[PDB]
Ligand SMILES: *CC(=O)N1CCC[C@@H](c2nc3ccccc3s2)C1
């Protein structure tokens with residue numbers, strides 16, 4: 001029993017984190033096989049942080065201008081390229097701790113763990129979601145760039161995120177590991193406004209199921225609703241629309257708890273319409289939207 | 305910017321987790337040097353889970369009755385003893401991944417990371433506090449026993465907790481790594497009621513400082529108070545008393561933010577007396593008490 005905001009063990013990703021220095025700029029890299037992935041803004045000289053032309057900036061850089069340090073040993077860079085907003089540094093040594101890995105672009109609502117790093121040294125691990133406005137509400141100081149988000153499937157690390165940006169509102173923008181930004185964000189020191197941070201309705205429902213499963217049931221009402229009706233209420237409260245895909249994905253939680261998805265929808269509707277009245281659900285005064293259905297099943301079944 | 309409930313990287317503790325089987329009972333062990341630490345209730349045969357005499361139960365056990373599996377290789381047990389509520393199994397092989405480690409008994413209010421494990425395989429990592437009633441609000445299924453709580457100081461793992469018990473109210477009781485339970489709990493299937501789960505006042509204050517530091521300032525009031533006055537209010541709201549030690553420990557946060565500790569006390573008092581009025585602080589509708597002052601400084605300074 002008990003439900004916790006839980007990250008994947010970080011061990012496999014700790015073994016991949018290196019320091020990358022270009023001139024006086026230092027941030028974190030990801031060493032997989034003989035390639036080190038890092039944000040290309042490592043090449044920005046504390047001056048061109050406004051309107052960089054990365055192609056032109058890069059012409060001035062050589063293999064030997066990129067300093068890669070894994071523990072307290074330097075890696076030899078034998079090649080470098082730009083793919084979108086990342087640099088791939090070819091090193092002469094394969095990372096001996098390279099786990100089974102993929103690179104995957106996640107959708108909004110998807111949760112992942114972040115290993116926050118400084119000078120290639122990991123400092124902490126937290127659980128995140130990709131927000132519907134393609135930001136993440138991270139924790140990231142200066143030098144945290146190149147820190148990565150990931151999911152683990154048994155022994156395979158799916159890398160979904162690399163850290164690049166803090167928006168002036170203190171939320172976070174980053175790329176997949178092909179260096180394509182999630183959302184409309186650019187690696188440029190420019191007014192960039194995030195859109196509406198809507199609540200991930202499907203994740204709230206999974207977490208309401210997680211609560212029932214752990215004994216917190218006070219919010220279970222006598223009512224049901226329809227997808228159309230529920231969705232009028234969602235719209236009003238800045239909740240993402242519920243699709244038949246969301247209902248299908250919740251099936252197993254529905255099954256295990258014997259609460260129809262649409263019944264749980266009607267419970268959510270009342271909690272939105274009436275608030276918590278000073279009560280809590282799994283020790284929270286608001287509705288948590290950063291556990292997926294897949295996350296709840298994992299933590300309510302002890303998957304490793 | 306951004307403040308997150310952050311665990312230590314789990315890598316160093318992942319490398320210590322093994323499976324321990326006695327008869328048909330399996331749970332997790334901690335392999336440091338040539339010793340495997342596990343909860344002694346590994347010896348309870350799905351029947352004596354009510355009134356075990358561990359000394360007598362243990363007479364019937366031999367070195368070869370304890371099956372220790374590290375990855376998919378078995379360790380040879382060359383000795384076994386009981387220290388309080390843990391077993392120490394001497395194996396013939398030193399753990400090659402044994403980090404620098406201590407064993408430390410923490411005080412209530414102290415935070416630590418838990419690597420939740422099943423059959424010696426780690427499934428997730430979360431941040432905890434030792435509650436003033438000496439419980440922890442964990443997430444733990446069957447087979448999670450022997451999962452450990454820890455702090456990391458640079459490269460030294462201070463192990464503070466080993467998991468043993470779920471109380472009938474779904475909170476968690478465990479031992480330090482000398483096998484002494486935190487609080488009055490016993491490794492026995494018996495009515496055990498936890499006491500009053502009070503709020504860790506010092507941790508709430510640190511987290512209010514963390515908020516100021518991250519831009520959430522709406523709750524900063526025009527008032528101050530005294531330790532005595534504030535403590536009348538704390539008492540009424542089931543908050544732990546604030547000592548001069550707590551004030552001293554908050555000094556540096558006070559310094560960095562230029563908000564006197566007692567001024568922040570008066571802000572807390574108003575939030576207790578008036579509630580949140582539907583607002584949030586660092587994306588929370590209640591007052592978080594599971595970040596220590598030491599935790600805030602770490603995450604608001606990028607320590608690795
Ligand atoms: C996020 C981090 O740790 N960084 C440290 C190295 C330089 C820094 C940059 N931020 C920007 C923003 C816009 C353009 C260029 C750069 S470099 C990233």
Ligand SMILES: *CC(=O)N1CCC[C@@H](c2nc3ccccc3s2)C1
Pocket residue numbers: 329330331345346348352353354356445446447448449450467468469491492493
């Ligand atoms: C917590 C866990 O994973 N366990 C699995 C192995 C046996 C189980 C026990 N619980 C109790 C409680 C009271 C007395 C004896 C035992 S064995 C622990």
